[PDB]
């Protein structure tokens, strides 16, 4: 109930695996009766970890580590696993019921109307395949999850309802529809036919500021919208931004892959300093990310053309050619510190829209898609 007291339901220690370093560490969990798994550094005598375990998969395995437990939730489209590991089976089985336990207490489309055309990603959980609904001609992304990835009936209708009902957001890829079939999960969404900003950086090499002002504007709209509702990206980088047929920006959504990297050796993603430390992370990493692909637009190159260490000691150099304005709005996107970052404050993206850089945005054309583009994409096929 909402006016009772939230209660301990099983609390002790576990060794969790990190988000993005993917090491093991020991961790005091406190599993609550409201569905929150609240981890700490130490035993209390601020929380690290917070997560619901409510509409939760829970699997036990052995490997890598004997006696290990996975809780899988679905994020919207995305798969998200958190693992955890015990000292015995006994113990891993108190767990896992407890944690069961807390999340039961909180409770015609086919695949054969589509034609299926390419591959437009893959990963641990799916793959993402170009697809042509039959009965209309029209062309959509389908993020279709394996087998092993079980979710809810309720769960999926919910994701349905809640797409229709938020349709001004023109930046980021509609889910269109979702439905299951016997075994899988699949997802009904946008594809963008004006091509992946990466092949069209890589093609011109370098962006115009006002072209990369052009398309930074869009991303900060869209990250206001998402931060409004409390919702991070973390992904912003050029390979998740496409180009729709007019030469608007599409923010994607096709993850299928697992989070973060066994250490700081193995990375060239350019995560934010926050996240390679393992400390509190929110709303900022997106103004980090937003850095790091403008950063690229305009330069040309990443910033560090070791990288552990040079994101959390090293300076960003800026080429001569850079405005003060262009220099200023990097400088202040790629700060270390995130309460000192452009975008961190309490204000968040207004602070970004405020920025010299962007004084000829206006802001309402922006979110209105009443911006004309500087390059209209050439008329492709869908499949080309
Ligand atoms: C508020 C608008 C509707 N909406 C909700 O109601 C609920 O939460 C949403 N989450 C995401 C969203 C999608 C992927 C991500 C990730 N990169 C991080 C990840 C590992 O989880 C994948 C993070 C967040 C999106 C979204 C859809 C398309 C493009 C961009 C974001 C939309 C919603």
Redesign the pocket.
Known sequence: GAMDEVSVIKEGWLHKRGEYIKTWRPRYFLLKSDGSFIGYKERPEPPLNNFSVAECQLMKTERPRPNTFVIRCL????V?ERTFHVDSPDEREEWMRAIQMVANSLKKVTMNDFDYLKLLGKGTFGKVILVREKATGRYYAMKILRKEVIIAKDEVAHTVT??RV?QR?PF????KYAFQTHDRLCFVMEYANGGELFFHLSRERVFTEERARFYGAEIVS?LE??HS?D?????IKLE?LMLDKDGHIK???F?LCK?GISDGATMPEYLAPEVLEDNDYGRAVDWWGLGVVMYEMMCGRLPFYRLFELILMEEIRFPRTLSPEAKSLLAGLLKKDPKQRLGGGPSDAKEVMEHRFFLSINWQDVVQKKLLPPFKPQVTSEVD
Do not use: K, M, P
């Not at 980021?172 to 889910?175: D, E, G, I, R, S």
């Not at 919702?231 to 992904?235: A, I, K, N, S």
């Open positions: 994020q919207w489209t995305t998200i809640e797409s938020l957001h980021l890829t509609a889910l869209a919208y998402l509702r919702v991070v990206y973390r992904d998740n923010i994607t959504d993850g989070e």
